[PDB]
Design a binder for this molecule. Structure first.
Ligand code: TYK
Ligand code: TYK
Ligand code: TYK
Ligand code: TYK
Ligand code: TYK
Lengths: 312, 310, 298, 297, 292
């Protein structure tokens, strides 16, 4: 297992991030636990979850499954860098009661308290915004997060689905008064969707955030979606054909590709079974030749950074 | 129900603020709870109280009435933005024991501890100065408030009965050391009394404070004389509202909801009927003719310096 | 002559400020204002031509420049964009024009003519700091601000080491006391000198009814004022000025004497002691609103 | 003429920016003055253009006093430090610009492009030297990313300095990707947005009828020209007028070579587009939306 | 010619830095250095030197505009060291001797432990703000002097040291303990003075015909097996070192220039690098260098 610093900070994490969104809705508790043990066994120390995982009327269930996993002891809590999120509506799906979603200090307080109860732990290592909230100013957000820091309830703060300028504004605001800023950004990033390269990833790299790629196979579409059974199909076909030609698995290459991108800490890997985890772990050891990198780049061009992306 | 951001911050509030001053002194606990459930049903999430509500020897009773409401469960606490106040004498009415009113860190400590006990909760969402205290510096006040923020005992700080320059001084002082300053001013504003517009509301807007109008009916006066220079003015008002078939109480509220910078008025119902009426005032549109008429009868000063100079 | 600190700063000024309004006639009161010990000269009308007349005054030598605290103002007054108001652009052009007309290399107190709510204080303080570091200006003052504008301005200045506004020139007199609600409280809090403009309310407090004989309610008021002073042996124009010199935070009124007789009258106004009984009755005739928020709430 | 604040600052500008893209230049600049345009930029829609402004100002008649003068860093294989935004390159470019313009100050000095190799403490040192000498009033950007505006202005504010007051970016019906992050950031930080190539190099200027490329781009332009035929609207005027409806936009740079093109740009600033016309332009020329919603959710 | 950012700043310099050791022949070698694409001129020895540069710019032809001009500071009290007093008199004399209105890189000649940084940055900021100096650099500092200096400048918004000139070559590698780590952390370019250790790595044992001589012998003998010139290799070695901007070279002739230029084009094999590292061990970073 390859390890790296999470951006500029002192925290070392596995290049694979274990996603947990399947634990609860699709994978049962006992199997989720076996996967998490398997993940530790493979050297994966970075586990990602969210208050809202579990979905609909079972929001919170995933956090509860990690809580029962820690409760078995055996140094599980101690070995893991635990990440969860705040922003989402935790009540009935649909329009939220005011201040029961988004990033007011009010929603942060109630969300973190509920997450700590479900996770059965006194601290979260990486507390992440699920999304930018353009209505909440950073002096409010940093007040909320600093209260939790100083109480020992969280260590690090991270972002998810931010724009590049939000990352800059957050970290400049934090730095003004000596606070550690965002340490990581979780953006949608994969061969199909490369527009994070325009500004989100450049900002992250400037400010020393780790970059965590969610949906690394683009919902499945890069995992061998055509062999399984618009003009997007021609790309995918050319993709599989190129990987047939070279003997490589689609699912594994989508992950290995992300590992070659500048600034990228690693992909979120969201296995349903211990078999799919072991595949992810192979993808991490895989080495991709400069020839196959050119090919994928030709099939899946990236925008490049702004302003060059749309101007010069 | 129309919602809005409280000034520049991420908190979203109903444009009606439920005032609780009647809960205890005139409306009773059981009925107060009735009204507060109806306010939730109406989409009102913003509840305003104060330690001194109750009046006389019953000061504190409103806070307790809120406390027993939260104790019923059903996510009542979790659904409200709870706001209370510090400054007032909580002992026997008349001259205060020193440091038992006003805004010394000493009075702030003892006031918040008693409010949290009565309210039956571990935190207040919005803790408001009831009035400006010009004898207490902002480095002292913000120390006291910052202690409460970091302990998780309050989230936001607001003001009430400030001058505009007090708003600027407070928030400039907070911003110097990276603190969130005042998020709202609760000022006396209505058709009769519009001198908040000279400097209070301009200042609040510059600094991104919510503006919450208290005494939106000027203590009943804008409610009815059906039941000397000023009698004449109110007469002209009630006659205008007879012409258009509009309730006086509803227009005074809806008018404040047209003012630039105004979050909304504090509505203080004695009864569930008075509440449903406030909700109706929130739904009212006022024609440009009615707005222009009210402005003639009840002129505003406009901003300083233009208000008295040019 | 009574002298005072201009607010919190180290500059000492006369409690009479010499405002404005022939050339050698102006030079003569100015020399006379000096001999009377008035050191604080302001180009505010009680623009371009007045500066030139000060300019020719200084050009005569005799330590005239060295002896005076020279205050001027952004020119102001349908204008071409940026030829009014307080952009860094307008400030640059107004100051350079003023220095050329005043025929001096520095202005002691450079003042804003009016609040401009479209220009942020980091822009304004940039423009002023350029001039301070070049030595073209010493102190910065306001005119026709709100209390909160004074607060914003001095807080912004103080964040980066800068001296803020040292003075505010506002309309303040027996007739118009609404400066007392917030402007003068803000000024007092931040250590600004308050310079009272139109101290006689455009002449209304200088004995305008007795000068008429040679609005219903306001006339009743002036009439009750002239009669109170008749009763007390006191010149109205002098009492208007003396009243202001009793008010908390007031540096002094602007006066525009054109003769030894008018200068001597302002000087006697500054030496005048109004009795508690006079002050009590003036307060009754011309009530102030008190500070906000007590002024309109409690 | 419609006037606006340049972003958050107190400087008032016309919503048309005269891109000076000698004798026929001088003529059009006087007509722009008389039309109430006070905002003159040396951005091409550099070298000679500045000299042409300099001889304009040397004619006198309060011309320098009446204009907001904006220029740019020159830019350009370059000799080291004769391109980009080192303090060394800024000194030499401004000194040469002041010489050519025959003026002792520039009102708005702009970066020509983001330089990723120069830290903002270096850039702000260079600009603060000039501001404190009086050679420059305001600073602006061109061809920046959203995060570069944020970084610039946070760095400036930290030590009390006025940051960027304006960004010049490529923005028109055809190219709307500035809306992802550049314009959002400019709006957050209170920069004026100045739209260069507002007709996308003539292409929105009725380019298919002046024939009297890619198949899909031509299809798009065709519907545009047909929509405006239907409504009786000049395509050149509409491209400009659409930019004036966009949140955050101060205005477009125009390079009128004739009284006719000037008068046209002036009419565009007075034109009101109906909601139906706005809906239809939007359908033909869709914007990406703000990031992250533009590519995520 | 190879170019690099000077540390973290936006200034681009040649990886060879032209130092100095009559008049029209200095002028001619400077012209030749431009033609080879060297833009970085330093008055440091590898008064009169500044005057020679002055007459060079006085010829015109965009000579001043094409070069990054670096000079340095420098006993009667305050006529040495880094007092605001000596800085002022030294820079005034430099600008006159150099016949220019600005210096691109103004460098301290040595650490002065008796002057605080608030006094030094006052003096530098005055000059930066009058336009007389762009960038500030150090020479012969400790690592902690670099940290203190740049932390002090950052406090009040000011650009700190952009470069350190230290004694660094195969023979003297102790700058690697802390000076070069500090410079790397703070984003200073590292300029290697005496890159040939006074000519000891320039083929000295051949030129003549204790246990230091043993070292130089294994060096010269290794460079015979590979068909490499010692002069060139000591330069190329430094160019492979982390944090190094480049060496100060003082060519007097077109012939030595061309040697310097070749040494910047040269690529040493990992075999050669490994062998140089064996003959000339470095201490590593503190605290590992002396503890663990
Ligand atoms: C002590 C001496 C007397 O008292 C005064 O002379 C005080 C008056 O000057 C007040 C303030 C005036 O009222 C003021 O008139 C100004 C023109 C307004 O100023 C305006 C214009 C502005 C530019 O100044 C601006 O800044 C400001 C905000 O608005 C101002 N405003 C605040 C509204 C307003 O208070 C007048 C209007 C005319 O002058 C109001 C009327 C009803 C009046 O005569 C009242 C008299 C009273 C109560 C007492 C006695 C005599 O009153 C006697 O009281 C005894 C008990 C009996 O003898 C009585 O007889 C039966 C009676 O005799 C007459
Ligand atoms: C390996 C070389 C091949 O090159 C490619 O396969 C590259 C293509 O995949 C490009 C990028 C596609 O064009 C992309 O189509 C996506 C659906 C869009 O993505 C969408 C969806 C989104 C979610 O991704 C979003 O983020 C994005 C912004 O918009 C995307 N956009 C950035 C606009 C757009 O570039 C396709 C559209 C369909 O697939 C465009 C068509 C006209 C095309 O074939 C063009 C050129 C070339 C030279 C093809 C050769 C084949 O030619 C021959 O193919 C043989 C198989 C080889 O062996 C060679 O023969 C020896 C070779 O010869 C040259
Ligand atoms: C729109 C219809 C009428 O207009 C109004 O009714 C407006 C009035 O309400 C004004 C403002 C009042 O004057 C206010 O009296 C308040 C008690 C003061 O409030 C006090 C107390 C406070 C608590 O509010 C405090 O906050 C404040 C600062 O001070 C307040 N102050 C700001 C000074 C002061 O403006 C009244 C006093 C009594 O109401 C003054 C009297 C002499 C008056 O009527 C004068 C002029 C005009 C032009 C009247 C028209 C025409 O009247 C007729 O209207 C018909 C519709 C037409 O067809 C015409 O008929 C022919 C026309 O007649 C020509
Ligand atoms: C007004 C309604 C019409 O809708 C439009 O005309 C919308 C089109 O203009 C879209 C956006 C174009 O697609 C764009 O093609 C550009 C070349 C790309 O731009 C490029 C270049 C760039 C420089 O812009 C760059 O910045 C950008 C990122 O990529 C751009 N990209 C953002 C991906 C891409 O959206 C076209 C391709 C060319 O015109 C795509 C094709 C398949 C298409 O027609 C699809 C759907 C519809 C529903 C058309 C109707 C016609 O149908 C009927 O047409 C009648 C005339 C109407 O009146 C209606 O009748 C009622 C209507 O019926 C509903
Ligand atoms: C490739 C392998 C070769 O390895 C070297 O040649 C490495 C040597 O250069 C080391 C480092 C020297 O030791 C250094 O001697 C300098 C004068 C000191 O420098 C001084 C002065 C300063 C100014 O530099 C200062 O900065 C510094 C701190 O202190 C320095 N210091 C760090 C203390 C000190 O390490 C020598 C002294 C002379 O050269 C010390 C003695 C005990 C010695 O001969 C040891 C080993 C040898 C001979 C190994 C062979 C060569 O010898 C044969 O080479 C053949 C090619 C092969 O067959 C080999 O087979 C393995 C072998 O055979 C026997």
């Amino acid at each position: 297992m390859e390890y790296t610093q999470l951006g500029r900070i002192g925290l070392k994490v596995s290049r694979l991030v274990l996603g947990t969104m399947n634990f609860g809705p699709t994978t049962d508790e006992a199997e989720s636990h076996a996967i998490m043990d398997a993940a530790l066994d493979a050297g994966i120390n970075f586990f990602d979850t969210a208050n809202v995982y579990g979905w609909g009327e079972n929001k919170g269930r995933t956090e509860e499954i990690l809580g029962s996993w820690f409760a078995q002891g055996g140094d599980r809590r101690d070995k893991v860098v635990l990440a969860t999120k705040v922003y989402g509506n935790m009540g009935l799906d649909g329009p939220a009661w005011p201040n029961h979603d988004k990033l007011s200090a009010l929603n942060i307080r109630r969300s973190v308290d509920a997450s700590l109860k479900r996770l059965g732990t006194d601290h979260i290592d990486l507390y992440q915004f699920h999304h930018v909230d353009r209505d909440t100013p950073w002096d409010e957000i940093w007040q909320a997060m600093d209260v939790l820091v100083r109480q020992g309830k969280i260590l690090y703060v991270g972002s998810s689905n931010f724009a590049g300028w939000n990352i800059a504004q957050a970290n400049e605001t934090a730095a003004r008064h000596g606070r550690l800023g965002l340490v990581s950004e979780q953006c949608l990033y994969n061969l199909c969707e490369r527009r994070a390269e325009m500004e989100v990833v450049p900002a992250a790299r400037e400010y020393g955030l780790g970059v965590i790629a969610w949906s690394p196979l683009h919902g499945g579409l890069l995992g061998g979606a055509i062999r399984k059974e618009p003009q997007q199909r021609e790309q995918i076909q050319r993709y599989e054909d190129l990987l047939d030609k070279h003997g490589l698995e689609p699912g594994e290459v989508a992950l290995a590709w992300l590992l070659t991108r500048p600034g990228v800490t690693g992909p979120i890997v969201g296995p349903r079974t211990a078999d799919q985890l072991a595949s992810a772990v192979r993808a991490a050891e895989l080495t991709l030749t400069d020839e196959v990198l050119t090919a994928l780049d030709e099939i899946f061009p990236g925008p490049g950074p702004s302003p060059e992306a749309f101007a010069w």
